[PDB]
């Protein structure tokens, strides 16, 4: 429940993070204009990415690890090849098919990339053609975050509709309509089982859902917690729910009961991103105080 | 603990030196936030200093100016307005001859936008600059269509004083914030002179806080 290492970030601010497949390396995204691939054990940065567009709000690390995706409000998604013959980092192709701000990019597969944008719709992209194969419409609000299943077949996205809409990747078809939120879904996360998911939003209430149930199992709310929720993540075995908050501290609620199991108050600033490794040894927390911190 | 670890240390030192140099190079440039509304004279203002947001860079004397034009965003403003928390100045453009155009007149809704952007929490202390546009047409055509509450003469000076006064009355939670207003003639040579003196005054007053003086 204490800090084990402190990356201290790179230069200014930190918005989003994504744990790699190796479970040793992470990607850090920030408004400064530099994307940094980090090492957890050695506390040494292993890659630096300049950005043509300074404004970036999302980052994705591929499950293979060959590619990393960064994008922002410029309407252009940039996918960079980490492993090149030159050894540099070069954007594979520009992805400019949205009229809004690219809120969250996620890597279904090397070929198939899912992007959520301010155009109030999502679209599957192919790297070879740079063309949308399936465009998921229906979200009235601008889709702010999507969570992908482990199977990479069914995924859910969330917007400023106070609702979540499931999507099938193959046919571009809305699969479920989840409702129960009172405010904009700031972030969404998928259960590692693939059968459920829980969300948090600005109404300071975390909410658990199941894809087939389409129903609220139980809400996680505290009277002292008026602070809105910016990040949600899960343990590998359940019985845990790590959650960022607007109160400048992170909190850990039990998945089944939501007691005040863990109080997490290291970061001085708003916890922008909260990520857990795929095997689950450590939790990484990032914020706009320029600091990245990994605890256990 | 071998040659691989020593080499990783050297590379990690290398990228940090490069990062520090790039940050020091970037810190000099002055960031400006343009908030042009429709036919507010965006083409005019970009000509006078000479699918997402449009970035421009103009150099005045010894000072660099990077200004980001948020144009045709077509999205909820709150979700990305805080990305410009660190900006030094917010430039506003408002047409003056839009007092005869109803979509809710454009002046009233522009006032509401100014009230919202002034009264927010992030912009507690950010200096606000506002420009004007189409004032010669406004003086030529002119009152009762948009502001019957004036009950004053259609004289351009008197009417323009009334309009600018009411717009500067939108200083909500702006005790620390300043409203530099300007009678933009739309043909004045360097209206960036107002911007340079305004940003210079802001830099001076913030330098006092940097020393702890004020």
């Amino acid at each position, epitope marked *: 429940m204490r800090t084990r290492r402190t990356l201290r970030g790179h230069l200014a601010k930190i918005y989003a993070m994504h744990w790699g497949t*190796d479970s*040793r*390396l992470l990607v850090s995204a920030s408004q400064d204009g530099k994307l940094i691939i980090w*090492d957890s054990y*050695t506390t040494n940065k*292993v*890659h630096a990415i300049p950005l043509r567009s300074s404004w970036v709000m999302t980052c994705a690390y591929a499950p293979s690890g060959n590619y990393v995706a960064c994008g922002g409000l410029d309407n252009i998604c940039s996918i960079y090849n980490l492993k090149t*013959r*030159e*050894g*540099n980092v070069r954007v594979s192709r520009e992805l400019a098919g949205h009229t809004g701000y690219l809120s969250c990019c996620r890597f279904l597969d090397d070929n198939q990339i899912v992007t959520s944008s301010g155009d109030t719709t999502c679209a599957l992209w192919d790297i070879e053609t740079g063309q949308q194969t399936t465009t998921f419409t229906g979200h009235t609000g601008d889709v702010m975050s999507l969570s992908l299943a482990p199977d990479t077949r069914l995924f859910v996205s969330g917007a400023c509709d106070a609702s979540a809409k499931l999507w099938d990747v193959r046919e571009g078809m809305c699969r479920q309509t989840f409702t129960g939120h009172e405010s904009d879904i700031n972030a969404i996360c998928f259960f590692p089982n693939g059968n459920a998911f829980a969300t948090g939003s600005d109404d300071a209430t975390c909410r658990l859902f199941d894809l087939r149930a389409d129903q609220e199992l139980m809400t996680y709310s505290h009277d002292n917690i008026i602070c809105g929720i910016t990040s949600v993540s899960f343990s590998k075995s359940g019985r845990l729910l790590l959650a960022g908050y607007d109160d400048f501290n992170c909190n850990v609620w039990d998945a089944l009961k939501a007691d005040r199991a863990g109080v997490l108050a290291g970061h001085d600033n708003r916890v922008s991103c909260l990520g857990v490794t795929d095997d689950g040894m450590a939790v990484a927390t990032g914020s706009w105080d320029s600091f990245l911190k990994i605890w256990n | *603990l*071998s*040659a*691989e670890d*020593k*080499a*990783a240390v*050297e*590379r990690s*030192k*290398m990228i940090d*030196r490069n990062l520090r140099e790039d940050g020091e190079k970037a810190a000099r440039e002055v960031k400006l936030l343009l908030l042009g509304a429709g036919e507010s004279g965006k083409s005019t203002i970009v000509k006078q200093m000479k699918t997402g947001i449009v970035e421009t860079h103009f150099t005045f004397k010894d000072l660099h100016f990077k200004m980001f034009d948020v144009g045709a965003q077509r999205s909820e403003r709150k979700k990305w307005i805080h990305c410009f928390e660190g900006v030094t100045a917010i430039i506003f453009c408002v047409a003056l001859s839009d007092y005869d155009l109803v979509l809710m007149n454009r002046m009233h809704e522009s006032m509401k936008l100014f009230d919202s952007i002034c009264n927010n929490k992030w912009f507690t202390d950010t200096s606000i600059i506002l420009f004007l546009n189409k004032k010669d047409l406004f003086e030529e055509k002119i009152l009762t269509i948009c502001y019957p509450e004036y009950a004053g003469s259609n004289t351009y000076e008197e009417a323009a004083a009334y309009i600018q006064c009411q717009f500067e009355d939108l200083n909500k939670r702006k005790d620390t914030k300043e409203i530099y207003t300007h009678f933009t003639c739309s043909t004045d040579t360097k209206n960036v002179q107002f911007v340079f003196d305004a940003v210079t005054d802001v830099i001076i007053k913030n330098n006092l806080k940097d020393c702890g003086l004020f």
Partner: single-chain antibody, 232 residues
Framework: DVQLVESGGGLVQPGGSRKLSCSAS????????MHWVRQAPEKGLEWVAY????????YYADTVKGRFTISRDDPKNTLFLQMTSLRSEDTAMYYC??????????????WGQGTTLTVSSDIVMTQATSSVPVTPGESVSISCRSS???????????LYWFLQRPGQSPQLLIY???NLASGVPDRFSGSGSGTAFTLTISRLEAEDVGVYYC?????????FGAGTKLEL
């Protein structure tokens, strides 16, 4: 892709000095670390010199200290190495080598053409036999026998194995005992314990001929293996 062309590898008076340099193009040599490897006219690759990306750390061998010098040039994008006090053992077929260093990087991946230079403790590794007669289609194995264990405290051993095609630049087969290199068929696979090591050549055909080498990467004085010929 990449280009490494060495410059002016010729005759040198005994004990004298001569500037050698691998002209470089097509890669981020600013961000890449560089090595040099000697090849005696018949047998024996052994490491010579190291220059890092930031030109901060300079590591030499037992006979290499002082009498050699290394240098670089980032705007013109090339690599220099000056050698003084050249004798018979100092004559070798030096190969300009690039090697980037981080987690999962593949050092010693690309090589040049060579320096035709003719004039006029330490960890010990030896492969068992230097000659193995083979048949095009049956699986063989060759073993490099170290003298100390290569298993570091962090639980990951450091061990890189090399193939040399007859007359040309060598390649990297497998790095740190478990990871095959790019552009290499899967038929080659290293194996062994933390102290004893052996190859797994499977279904060899008429491009695997050449000499095979081993290397440690647990101490800064890197020393390759003796080399093993795989004749048909």
């Amino acid at each position: 892709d990449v280009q490494l062309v060495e410059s002016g590898g010729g005759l040198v008076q005994p004990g004298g000095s001569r500037k050698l340099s691998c002209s470089a193009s097509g890669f981020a040599f600013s961000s890449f670390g560089m090595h040099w490897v000697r090849q005696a006219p018949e047998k024996g690759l052994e490491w010579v010199a190291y220059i890092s990306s930031g030109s901060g750390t300079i590591y030499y061998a037992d006979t290499v200290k002082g009498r050699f010098t290394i240098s670089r040039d980032d705007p013109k994008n090339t690599l220099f190495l000056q050698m003084t006090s050249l004798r018979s053992e100092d004559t070798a077929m030096y190969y300009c080598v690039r090697s980037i260093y981080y987690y999962g990087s593949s050092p010693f991946d690309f090589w040049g053409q060579g320096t035709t230079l003719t004039v006029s403790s330490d960890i010990v590794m030896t492969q068992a036999t230097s000659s193995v007669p083979v048949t095009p289609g049956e699986s063989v194995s060759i073993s490099c026998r170290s003298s100390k264990s290569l298993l570091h405290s962090n639980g990951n051993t450091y061990l890189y194995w090399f193939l040399q095609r007859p007359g040309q630049s060598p390649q990297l087969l497998i790095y740190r005992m478990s990871n095959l290199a790019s552009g290499v068929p899967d038929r080659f696979s290293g194996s062994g314990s933390g102290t004893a090591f052996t190859l797994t050549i499977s279904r060899l055909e008429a491009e695997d001929v050449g000499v095979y080498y081993c290397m440690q990467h647990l101490e800064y004085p890197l020393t390759f293996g003796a080399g093993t010929k795989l004749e048909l």
